[PDB]
Amino acid sequence: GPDRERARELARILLKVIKLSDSPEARRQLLRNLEELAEKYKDPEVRRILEEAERYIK
């Protein structure tokens, strides 16, 4: 419900910073946070955000 909606919002934020970050270490750290979120909430919206984020981990 609201907790899931918060997880989706956090995931969107994590993706935004990934897209605007220079640092491979920062990107990996935020990606970890996303997989941690996917592991907890098992949510298809978080999943799609994680899938898009993985494309930026170069």
Partner: protein, 114 residues
């Protein structure tokens, strides 16, 4: 890992300065290479502090020279945002996201009166 805000609702006057506190646990000396601090409102990038460094080019224009992270506070677990000379366009939902051995975020609603 939890981010907490002592005040999630601000009613501020036009022309005020405002400081929004955003707290996160630090049970050691602060490890800067593991810390990311992010502040936004709507889709405006306010603060993007990544592992001890900021990119001035990322900050939204309407917050240039008006928003700053109080970096002295970070060692104490407070990622406080300070905004100078608040105007009507600064009303809205602010978000503070901390990633430091885990990630969390909080919303702060800011009403501007005048």
């Amino acid at each position: 890992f939890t981010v907490t805000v002592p005040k999630d609702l601000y009613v501020v006057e036009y022309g005020s300065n405002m400081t929004i506190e955003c707290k996160f646990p630090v049970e050691k000396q602060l490890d800067l290479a593991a810390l990311i601090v992010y502040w936004e409102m709507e889709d405006k990038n306010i603060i993007q502090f990544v592992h001890g460094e900021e990119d001035l080019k990322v900050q939204h224009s309407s917050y240039r020279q008006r928003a700053r992270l109080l970096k002295d506070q970070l060692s104490l677990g407070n990622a406080a945002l300070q905004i100078t000379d608040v105007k009507l366009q600064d009303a809205g939902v602010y978000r503070c996201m901390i990633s430091y051995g885990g990630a969390d975020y909080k919303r702060i609603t800011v009403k501007v009166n005048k």
